[PDB]
Design a protein around this ligand. Structure first.
Ligand SMILES: [Cl-]
Ligand code: NA
Ligand code: NA
Length: 128
């Protein structure tokens, strides 16, 4: 399925080249501009654990998730991954725990040492 495909066929987007964040572009977005550090970014996403369980979805909340890019307001894999995206792009990310919640995990649903799968759509970005 999609998690296996990004694991086996994804591109390493880390600056360290350590395979910690792998990406596949599913829908090409608009133009050639990616967001700027500090921009307000608006995303829709779904996340799954490696046991197949959905652990989060913005779609189910009927509102996007909004954060400031490159500020550590989200897991490292998201700061790195969203920075690569164009407006309107949909991607898949496969995130090793060093770029996610590490040994701590995140209650209630994310265990220790968890590799995470996300589908992410970059809806918009704006400088403030
Ligand atoms: Cl799938
Ligand atoms: Na596929
Ligand atoms: Na891109």
């Amino acid at each position: 399925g999609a998690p296996a495909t990004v694991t086996e066929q994804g591109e390493d987007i880390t600056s360290k080249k350590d395979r910690g964040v792998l990406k596949i572009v599913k829908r090409v977005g608009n133009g050639e501009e990616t967001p700027m550090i500090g921009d307000k970014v608006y995303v829709h996403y779904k996340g799954k654990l490696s046991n197949g369980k959905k652990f989060d979805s913005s779609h189910d909340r009927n509102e996007p998730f909004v954060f400031s890019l490159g500020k550590g307001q989200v897991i490292k894999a998201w700061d790195i991954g969203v920075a690569t995206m164009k407006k309107g792009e949909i991607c898949h990310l496969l995130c090793k725990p060093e770029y996610a919640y590490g040994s701590a995990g995140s209650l209630p649903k994310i265990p220790s040492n968890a590799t995470l799968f996300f589908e992410i759509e970059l809806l918009d970005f704006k400088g403030e």
